[PDB]
Amino acid sequence: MGRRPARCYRYCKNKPYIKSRYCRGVPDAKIRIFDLGRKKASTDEFPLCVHLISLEKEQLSSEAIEAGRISCNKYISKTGGKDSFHMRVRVHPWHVLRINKMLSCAGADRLQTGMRGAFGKPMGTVARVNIGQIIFSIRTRDNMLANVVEALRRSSYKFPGRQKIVVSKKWGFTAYNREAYQKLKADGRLMNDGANVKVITNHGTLAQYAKDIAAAN
């Protein structure tokens, strides 16, 4: 951060303070943009998924997150075409850090505005995670994987703590593996909504797929 070195905002403690109807001086987060690459690209056209995940519960800064994203931004021509690229982070710095400032910076002793009423003005906006919660995600085609992991590698340095990279067996941003996510197309009971999927509704819906047929189109 700017007023601090992120050593006092390394570890999760105190209950969550946020950008609220109680706080208000709360600054704007360092990124409000969380995707990178073809967001038009389909659920189906990209079937490759890697995650970034912490191993320790730690408060990643918004600035840090931004930095991480702009590794994977630049590792894209090196990768090969932004077309074959998605990203989403999946950790938004909702929570805000307090700073009681030390009024003395070149001299002058308080004991009057010392540690009395010494409650932080909110400066710092930050995200909490645990021992496996995701902190970057990349959907892509099965071409780039040694590229994306290297981008992640860069990202790993831009983040506090021991991270980890796991390749999901899913098609990227989906709760189905591949063994499943051909049977949906193959049997033809899938239903598409752009970047997402839906699936037809039998054990999904029943009271509204009782005397219904429009639910098999």
């Binding site: 400032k101 009024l103 910076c105 070149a106 001299g107 002058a108 002793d109 009057q112 505005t113 003005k121």
Partner: protein, 250 residues
Amino acid sequence: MSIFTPTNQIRLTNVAVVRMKRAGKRFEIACYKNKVVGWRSGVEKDLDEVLQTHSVFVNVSKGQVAKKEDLISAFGTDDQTEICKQILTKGEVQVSDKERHTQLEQMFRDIATIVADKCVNPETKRPYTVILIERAMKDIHYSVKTNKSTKQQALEVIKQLKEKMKIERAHMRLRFILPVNEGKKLKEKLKPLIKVIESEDYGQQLEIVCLIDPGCFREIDELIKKETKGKGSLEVLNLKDVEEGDEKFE
């Protein structure tokens, strides 16, 4: 100790005071010498980044905090946000050395940039020589004060340039509109006073007499020709001082 007590005085002075004299009462803010300056000429950072203390005193040195009531009385506001901002914008700052230097430089530039109109050209032109004006400013030993305005300083410097010596300069083109037969008379009168060119003689029409008059004593000059003439008339001007004509020794 004994009798020998480490006092070392009240609390360290080490920041810009911003003294605002509102409701006859002094309110002040812990900032920095440069930061305040930056704020007040464009660089709007954060309100508590430019302020090392986001609160208001009455005496920054002695470590005294004002009464909310006083603030209310003076400013008609309680929240320190607004009050602080006000203080920042319209209270007496303490500049650094660097800032002071910058200010000085600015002043210097604007007593050669304002004097670029009445510039010091060599034997022939070579019409601008603004660098040479700047150079000349301290060769005479001049107090380039940042208290006074630029225009005033310009006026001062030209008088000295006379006793440099290289003569005072301030010439433009006054195109005097002169009706009836007294115009001719006026023309005759003012020919030894200043230069006369682009003339015409008319009894049934206006006379466009173009003169080369003093520019830094121009209004006064304008006033004393009409009176001489007798009748009321119009005498147009340029802007203040221009370098269209000769500025070598003139």
